[PDB]
Design a protein around this ligand. Sequence first.
Ligand SMILES: Cc1nc2ccccc2nc1N1CCCC1
Ligand SMILES: [Mg+2]
Ligand SMILES: [Zn+2]
Length: 313
Amino acid sequence: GLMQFTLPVRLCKEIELFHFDIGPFENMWPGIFVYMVHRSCGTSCFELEKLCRFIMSVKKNYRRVPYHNWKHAVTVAHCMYAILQNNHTLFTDLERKGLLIACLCHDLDHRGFSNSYLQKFDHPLAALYSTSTMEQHHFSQTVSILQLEGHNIFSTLSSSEYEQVLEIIRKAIIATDLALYFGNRKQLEEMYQTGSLNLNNQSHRDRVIGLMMTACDLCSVTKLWPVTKLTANDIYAEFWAEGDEMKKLGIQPIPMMDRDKKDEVPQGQLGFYNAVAIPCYTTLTQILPPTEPLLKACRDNLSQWEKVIRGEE
Ligand SMILES: Cc1nc2ccccc2nc1N1CCCC1
Ligand SMILES: [Mg+2]
Ligand SMILES: [Zn+2]
């Protein structure tokens, strides 16, 4: 129990900042995730033998897609880590356990295609889960890996603590369905402004945890411009693939997914920052003030996209 993970000095310092990039060395990501668990949760939270075998089974069940990949999983876990560290006393022992694992698992077995494409393809998962189709699949896959022999990192929780942690993880992963974010944030907006937000009300915490998941899941928009810019290529490589597949179903895709309409991308990113990202981190900052660095990074990147459109890059 005296074995800490330690990181090189630049990573040790930069990992604590919201805008940290986990870097191109895949073999270091599991150690980065464990390091984050040890400092966020404790060295006692998980049996290291079990956690290591969980992490490696999770990694193996991420596919080789341009964006919805193992790197996305660890990137999203790091943003949750930063939120949790900058808000020490607001979160229970279980919530800190569940949420880092929820983030790591939130896109398990992603194929690079939206819930819409599955429905128009008539994919079997769309018959199994009529709404939040991939997100219900990600929770299913998370539970499957937890039930592999030697993989139950929760085995030392009590019956009821265990049911609490899986309930946190389920809602957490469902909340990453961006179709649910709009209504979720409107509600938190009203609650915050009419003063009725109440962090002891479990249905309120749930809404707040859901907004944190949307924030972590979108955190590509909160990195330094070079990282944001280069990730957007991966994001759009998946969208264009899906647009290609829509065209093979004899359906014109929305311009976002049409690779013939790449010119329209800078404007597409503006509407996204204005309609999703900025509102998301604004309301997050209102509820959890120390997350303001995400809002400032997001606004900085909105400004960079404006410059692309004005031909200044
Ligand atoms: C357009 C877009 N850009 C993003 C840029 C950074 C991170 C996530 C992003 N997600 C996006 N999608 C998801 C569903 C609608 C548009
Ligand atoms: Mg997802
Ligand atoms: Zn995701």
